[PDB]
Amino acid sequence: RSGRFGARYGRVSRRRVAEIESEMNEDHACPNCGEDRVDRQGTGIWQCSYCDYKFTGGSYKPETPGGKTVRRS
Amino acid sequence: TGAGTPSQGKKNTTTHTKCRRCGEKSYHTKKKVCSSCGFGKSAKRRDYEWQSKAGE
């Protein structure tokens, strides 16, 4: 996590980098199939190592609060 | 690093060269313009009244 930052930057900065990157690297359920195999390929780009589904999402999360809204309405 | 002697060693770029039109070593090979006769800049020959005393 923010351990690569050593004693630099301060709590907050590396506290959020940790959480953000923590949720970022968790197992994500592919929208195509349903397997927890989605990994980030770059900024806002995700791909499932299982079925190879490549798609767009949040910068650090595959889905954003606003994105989940579109579906509804 | 001093602006003098030590900085003079880095100078190995060719800029002004013999001009096809006037023969002076003033044809800037990067700009492709002669600073002496104006070749590359103007069909007319580079000239100025300040190249001599006003009343001469």
Binding site: I20, G44, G57, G58, S59, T64, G66, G67, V70 | -
Partner: protein, 237 residues
């Protein structure tokens, strides 16, 4: 004195230009004769250097391969539609008139056929509120109610890459890399830290603007610095 930095910018010299020769494409909506019979298939998701967001490469029926301003949730293989009769689903483009009220939209055109002007940045979206035969009311990301021609085209859904701003740059070096991909001179030296000759706030034994910062709208370039025509300042009240 000397021209301030803001004046050097206008000359458009290299230091202030955007690395355009490195930019990918201008994500303007496709131009359809009419009918909407235009459909394409998302062939790939790419990184857009000019927006720090992802873009989708699309192959249309008539053989046209073009990058498109992608909303969140668009993936390879998915089929997209662009026309008056396109289906109402994420990633599809059609005139506001055809869009159902209460639907998040992005890359909204200002004038019908201009290709899209509003809501194009990471994770943002305009909210189509009201319909009509003369005007379509849209709520832009800034919260402003915008009256638009119902004939103005737009893409359903919100822009991809949301939350980009939630993470701090943490270090100068990270800001550095992003700035190298924009038309911006960075880092920033404060006016108060410069000599009098270089800025209205320069000079003085200690640093401080020797004047009020709220400057008039009528001030000439070179003098219009600080808080431009502020309606107020601070946090109070």
């Amino acid at each position: 004195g000397r021209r301030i930095q803001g004046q050097r910018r206008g000359r458009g010299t290299s230091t202030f230009r955007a690395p355009s020769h490195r930019y990918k494409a201008d994500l303007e909506h496709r131009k359809v004769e009419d009918g909407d019979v235009i459909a394409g298939t998302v062939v790939d998701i790419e990184h857009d250097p000019a927006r720090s967001a992802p873009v989708a490469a699309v192959e249309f029926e008539d053989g046209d391969r073009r990058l498109i301003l992608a909303p969140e949730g668009v993936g390879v293989g998915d089929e997209l539609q662009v026309g008056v009769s396109a289906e109402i689903a994420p990633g599809n483009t059609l005139p506001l008139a055809e869009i159902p009220e209460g639907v998040p939209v992005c890359n909204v055109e200002s004038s019908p056929g201009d290709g899209g002007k509003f809501a194009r940045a990471s994770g943002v979206n305009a909210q189509l509120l009201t319909h009509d035969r003369n005007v379509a009311v849209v709520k832009l990301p800034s919260g402003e109610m915008k009256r638009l021609d119902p004939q103005c085209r737009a893409t359903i859904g919100v822009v991809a890459g949301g939350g980009r701003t939630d993470k701090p740059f943490v270090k100068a070096g990270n800001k550095h890399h992003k700035m190298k991909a924009r038309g911006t001179k960075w880092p920033n030296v404060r006016g108060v830290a410069m000599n009098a000759v270089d800025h209205p706030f320069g000079g003085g034994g200690r640093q401080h603007p020797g004047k009020p910062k709220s400057i008039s709208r009528n001030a000439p370039p070179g003098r219009k610095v600080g808080d431009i025509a502020s309606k107020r300042t601070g946090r109070g009240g």
